[PDB]
Amino acid sequence: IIIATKNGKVRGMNLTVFGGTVTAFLGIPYAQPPLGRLRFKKPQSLTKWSDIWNATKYANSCCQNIDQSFPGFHGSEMWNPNTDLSEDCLYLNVWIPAPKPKNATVLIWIYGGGFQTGTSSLHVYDGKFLARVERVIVVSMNYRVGALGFLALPGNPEAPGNMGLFDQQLALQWVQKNIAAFGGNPKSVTLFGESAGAASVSLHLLSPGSHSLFTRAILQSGSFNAPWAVTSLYEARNRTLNLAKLTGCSRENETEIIKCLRNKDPQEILLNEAFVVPYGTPLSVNFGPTVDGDFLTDMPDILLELGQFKKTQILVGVNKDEGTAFLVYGAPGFSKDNNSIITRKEFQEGLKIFFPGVSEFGKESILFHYTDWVDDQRPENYREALGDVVGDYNFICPALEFTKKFSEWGNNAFFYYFEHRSSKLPWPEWMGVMHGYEIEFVFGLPLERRDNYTKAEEILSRSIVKRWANFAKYGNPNETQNNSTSWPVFKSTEQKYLTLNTESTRIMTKLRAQQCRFWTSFFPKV
């Protein structure tokens, strides 16, 4: 099973999926290995190769810190890379239906991981199911994360910032030149991702270099206007200079700072990333997107406000409990091993950790806005409020606020609210419907009748997978089945959204309006 790309032939492998067949091509190189003189630089286009590339196993994951807070725990370890770490990691994967399609829609997955972690080869990103059930072509790339991906000495081509974003954009460029040879339609390409993946997709709506490289966009639990997504030039420069200091690379001029950084072992870079931001949070993104004047021609909120971005259709959404995952990474009183019932004071300590630079009036005003209890007897009040504080501020409110502005320029927007907690979720019950745990439903893992999961979870995933594909193909996440539930456009006034769960999905309006009003209209003044 061989395909001639513009750079050479690639051998693939036949997968047997659900009685049918899917053809997979794992680890196709799409850029030159960013090594030596090439570390910190934008990805260089690839040159032809003589023999045949065996695209039969996942490639190296990009250099990154590993989450080892809970050794042996499936809930944390499932996000860690499952192939070797290496700077030689610029590769992508293509999944294709059998029999081979003629002009198939392409879905391109961009993984999350706070711009510091992530890899395309995770089991929860296996695109074979989508290829089988909806007969789309699925692509996913590895892009550089952390300092190696986002170190910025702004204005300097030797370390310009947003290198990982250019990686993704180069992978998109690859699809355009090569996907017809796989039976895909370059003219029908939908970007989707989650967390930093979603913020990445949203930045691709803004970058002129990405304008001609895709068609529609799906944003799961993330957008560029989230408070963690984009770092200012001053902060990015400070962080870079802190890293130079931490690694013994503090130099007189920038060209020498970089020479020295190019000579550090990857691990001396990785293990120093944690120290560059003086009072980080469990949500702190050490090295991420910045305004480089290249990929991002200007500050994002301004571009969006002014109206210069790709005019197309989007599908945006969030999980019910986006904030709970981060509480066990340093909020006092919390633990994945107990119920984590906290007190008013532990809650105030929590705010301190999640809101380090904020005045006492500001924190006090957050406490006030999230303490108007329905039942004042309820002992889990503070635990839930802190989770909501962190979810609304970091994910939910940015996502709604993005969708309002985007739709205000006459674009079809569809908003979802994912409310189902997987019966397999390794994290304890109080954590609810966690950040990241809708992904396996999108990628159709519960369609596998040997995979554990409930029947209802198979049906739920069946329709999500159907709407995602139909949104990709058609620009409307419509479902079949004369029952269905009819998904309506998102508008600044009514703000209609669809809920997703196993016991009846319904159309609601103004998601968390009372909470979000605080974050968009008051908090920026404290």
Ligand X SMILES: *[C@@H]1O[C@H](CO[C@H]2O[C@@H](C)[C@@H](O)[C@@H](O)[C@@H]2O)[C@@H](O[C@@H]2O[C@H](CO)[C@@H](O)[C@H](O)[C@H]2NC(C)=O)[C@H](O)[C@H]1NC(C)=O
Ligand Y SMILES: *[C@@H]1O[C@H](CO)[C@@H](O[C@@H]2O[C@H](CO)[C@@H](O[C@@H]3O[C@H](CO)[C@@H](O)[C@H](O)[C@@H]3O)[C@H](O)[C@H]2NC(C)=O)[C@H](O)[C@H]1NC(C)=O
Ligand Z SMILES: *[C@H]1O[C@H](CO[C@H]2O[C@@H](C)[C@@H](O)[C@@H](O)[C@@H]2O)[C@@H](O[C@@H]2O[C@H](CO)[C@@H](O)[C@H](O)[C@H]2NC(C)=O)[C@H](O)[C@H]1NC(C)=O
Ligand U SMILES: *[C@@H]1O[C@H](CO)[C@@H](O[C@@H]2O[C@H](CO)[C@@H](O)[C@H](O)[C@H]2NC(C)=O)[C@H](O)[C@H]1NC(C)=O
> Could you list the residues that contact ligand Z (CB under 6 A)?
252-253, 255-256
Min separation Cβ 500 and ligand Y, Å: 18
Per-residue binding letters, 259-278, with its own copies (x by CB under 8 A) = --------------------
Which of 265, 357, 361, 486 touches its own copies (CB under 8 A)? 361
27 marked among binding-site residues: no
Hey, CA dihedral for 432, 438, 440, 444, is it positive or negative? positive
Query: To the nearest 10°, the Cα dihedral for 383, 461, 501, 387?
Result: 10
Any known ligand binding at 79? yes
Structure tokens at 175: 């699809």
Coil, helix or strand at residue 199 = helix
Q: Which of 76, 121, 188, 195 is catalytic?
A: 195
Contact call for residue 478 and Cl ion (CB under 5 A): yes
- Asked whether the CA dihedral 128, 134, 136, 140 is positive or negative, the reply is negative
54 vs 339 by CB, closer to ligand X:
54
Dist CA 349 CA 180 (whole Å): 55
Flag whether 72 is marked binding.
Answer: no
Residue window 74-113: x/- pattern of binding to ligand U, with contact defined by CB under 6 A = ------------------------xx--xx----------
| Interaction between residue 52 and ligand X (CB under 6 A) | yes
Taking CB under 5 A as the rule, does residue 412 contact Cl ion? no
List the x/- string, 445-474, binding to ligand Y by CB under 6 A. -------------------------x---x
Q: Is position 234 an interface residue for ligand X (rule: CB under 6 A)?
A: yes
Task: Decide if 137 contacts 171 (C-beta within 8 A).
Answer: no
Smallest gap, in angstroms, from Cβ of residue 285 to ligand NAG? 26
14 touching ligand U, by CB under 6 A: yes
Contacting ligand NAG (CB under 6 A), which of 45, 103, 423, 454?
103
* Contact call for residue 188 and ligand NAG (CB under 6 A): yes
**Among this protein's residues, is 420 annotated catalytic?**
no
> Could you confirm whether 364 is annotated as catalytic?
no
- Counting contacts by CB under 6 A, is residue 14 touching ligand NAG? yes
Block residue for tokens 């196709």: 28
Asked if 285 touches Cl ion (CB under 5 A), the answer is: yes
444 marked as part of a ligand binding site: no
Burial class (CB in 10 A: 0-12, 13-18, 19+), 248: exposed
First to last CA, the chain: 61
User: Residue 481 binds which one of its own copies, Cl ion, ligand X, none, with CB within 5 to 8 A depending on kind?
Assistant: none
> Residue 332, Cβ neighbours under 10 Å: how many?
16
Q: In this complex, which beta carbon is closest to ligand Z, that of residue 258 or of residue 500?
A: 258
Would you give the binding string for ligand X spanning residues 465-504, x where CB under 6 A is met? ------------------xxx------------------x
Q: Which is nearer to Cl ion, 20 or 266 (CB)?
A: 20
114 contacts: CB under 8 Å, gap ≥ 6: 195, 196, 228, 283, 285, 288
For position 358 contacting ligand U by CB under 6 A, the verdict is no
| CB distance 92 to 172 below 8 Å | no
- Given a contact cutoff of 8 angstroms between Cβ atoms, the answer to whether 196 and 118 are in contact is yes
- List all residues 6 or more positions away from 227 whose beta carbon is below 8 Å from its beta carbon: 393, 394, 398
Q: What is the DSSP string of 211-269?
A: GGG-SEEEEES--TTSTTT-B-HHHHHHHHHHHHHHTT---SSHHHHHHHHHHS-HHHH
DSSP-assigned letter for residue 38 = G
**Residue 365 contact partner, candidates its own copies, ligand U, ligand NAG, none, CB within 5 to 8 A by sort of partner:** its own copies
Q: Among 221, 435, 438, 461, which one carries the catalytic annotation?
A: 435
- What is d(CA 169, CA 296) in angstroms, rounded to the nearest whole number? 12
CB of 470 vs ligand Y, minimal distance in Å: 5
In the complex, the smallest distance separating the C-beta of residue 346 from its own copies, rounded to whole angstroms, is 20
Within residues 293-352, the interface with Cl ion by CB under 5 A covers 293
Q: Does 54 bind ligand X (CB under 6 A)?
A: yes
Supply 386's token pair. Answer: 């802190």
**Per-residue burial over 391-426, b = 16 or more CB atoms within 10 Å of its CB, e = otherwise:** bbbbbbbbbbbbbbbbbeeebbbbbbbbbbbbeebe
CA distance 446 to 441: 7
Closest approach, Cβ 349 to ligand Z, in A, equals: 46
- What does the DSSP assignment read for 273-336? GGGSSTT--TT--SS--B--SSSSSS-HHHHHHHT-S----EEEEEETBTTHHHHTTT-TT--T
Nearer to ligand X, 483 or 514 (CB): 483
Task: Please check whether residue 352 is in contact with residue 282, taking contact to mean a CB–CB distance below 8 angstroms.
Answer: no
**From the CB of 462, what's the least distance to ligand Y, in Å?**
13
Helix, strand or coil, per DSSP, at residue 106:
strand
- The residue from 265, 372, 375, 503 that contacts its own copies (CB under 8 A) is 372
Q: How far is the CB of 337 from ligand NAG (least distance, A)?
A: 6
Task: Report the nearest approach of ligand U to the CB of residue 21 (Å).
Answer: 4
94 to 11, 216, 224, 415: CA distances (angstroms): 12, 19, 27, 28
Is 407 designated active site?
A: no
Tokens of 117: 């972690």
Catalytic site positions = 195, 322, 435
Binding residues for ligand Y, per CB under 6 A? 470, 474, 476, 478, 480-481
Binding residues for ligand U, per CB under 6 A? 1, 14, 21, 98-99, 102-103, 185, 187-188
Binding residues for ligand X, per CB under 6 A? 51-54, 234-235, 238, 242, 245-246, 275-276, 278, 451-452, 463, 483-485, 504-505
Binding residues for Cl ion, per CB under 5 A? 18, 133, 154-155, 228, 285, 293, 430, 478, 486-487
Which residues fall in the annotated binding site for tacrine? 79, 435
